[PDB]
Design a protein around this ligand. Sequence first.
Ligand SMILES: Nc1nc2c(ncn2[C@@H]2O[C@H](COP(=O)(O)OP(=O)(O)O)[C@@H](O)[C@H]2O)c(=O)[nH]1
Ligand SMILES: Nc1nc2c(ncn2[C@@H]2O[C@H](COP(=O)(O)OP(=O)(O)O)[C@@H](O)[C@H]2O)c(=O)[nH]1
Ligand code: BEF
Ligand code: BEF
Ligand SMILES: [Mg+2]
Ligand SMILES: [Mg+2]
Lengths: 166, 166
Amino acid sequence: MTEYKLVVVGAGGVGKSALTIQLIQNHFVDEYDPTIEDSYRKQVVIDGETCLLDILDTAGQEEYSAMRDQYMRTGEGFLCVFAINNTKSFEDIHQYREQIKRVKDSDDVPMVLVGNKCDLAARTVESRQAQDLARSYGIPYIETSAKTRQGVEDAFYTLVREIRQH
Amino acid sequence: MTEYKLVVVGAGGVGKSALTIQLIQNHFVDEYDPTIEDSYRKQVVIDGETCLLDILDTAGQEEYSAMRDQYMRTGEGFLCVFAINNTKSFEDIHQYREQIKRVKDSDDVPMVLVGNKCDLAARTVESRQAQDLARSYGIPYIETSAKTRQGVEDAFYTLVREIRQH
Ligand SMILES: Nc1nc2c(ncn2[C@@H]2O[C@H](COP(=O)(O)OP(=O)(O)O)[C@@H](O)[C@H]2O)c(=O)[nH]1
Ligand SMILES: Nc1nc2c(ncn2[C@@H]2O[C@H](COP(=O)(O)OP(=O)(O)O)[C@@H](O)[C@H]2O)c(=O)[nH]1
Ligand code: BEF
Ligand code: BEF
Ligand SMILES: [Mg+2]
Ligand SMILES: [Mg+2]
């Protein structure tokens, strides 16, 4: 059992908790209950390795956020989530990544860019724009839907692979 | 705002996680995935006081028993859960109480005894038996169903009152 410390970050309402709860429960939360901080420990097998995923589900609402540097220091990899119908949330990614790099003293931090709510027909962030940003960072981009479950295991398992391969 | 460190304990499969998830997320989970350790932070008003509930959902599977001393040290109140269709879980919850007292070095630790799965017809632990045990401890007894949501808020809120009145 190999422990991986995953942290899920991004603006309020983008789907951090919904993605995480899908991974853990195979349930879609329809309600938006702004997170303070929840943590999970989930055993999974990824490429034949028994993994203990320590997942921190963080506050994206500024009103509820505290002490981001602390959880950035301890995290091994970061799921950086935006919503494809929220341009501001995409712009906020860049700031999350900058802060993570600063806290880690490194531009090579395990990270996956997640464009969530890909079940929504009306999007404002085109896939290619996000693919381009991820390419600039040298990290994977995965499109997800917590509603349909598209990409949920892919996003988390890819992040594990990025940590393993670090 | 007052923080309350609640810890949900008891044998594997009695419904600790299902209760916690009902309280927070207002849905019932049918699949059983044994907990390692999960934590939730949730703000609520109880008896005219704004409270931050820090809820630790613990492992009942004995393979994770090494983690107990730590969470028993830090926890302020314990939701002691058994299932009304599982007599072994009732016997076990007595040992949980004894262990908590030992770790705290105190006979008066805030606790609530919870008889879960009270939606099931095939009861093997009579309410009177659990009432007798709770009376011996000097603590409340509440019957719950994570499936129907019966008693769920009552259980957690009663535990907060037990801490406040300690
Ligand atoms: N249509 C759609 N709604 C989503 C999706 N992910 C989350 N939501 C909804 O978006 C809201 C906020 O999700 P939540 O995970 O609580 O946000 P966060 O934890 O603050 O990032 C809730 O109402 C969810 O039901 C998604 O992939 N598709
Ligand atoms: N009928 C019924 N099943 C329940 C109830 N609470 C939990 N369960 C089921 O019992 C199993 C174990 O629940 P879980 O919360 O994971 O147990 P834990 O190991 O104590 O956390 C799951 O299949 C749940 O769906 C309840 O109140 N009624
Ligand atoms: F949990 Be979300 F960031 F409000
Ligand atoms: F989460 Be249970 F105790 F397996
Ligand atoms: Mg959230
Ligand atoms: Mg559990």
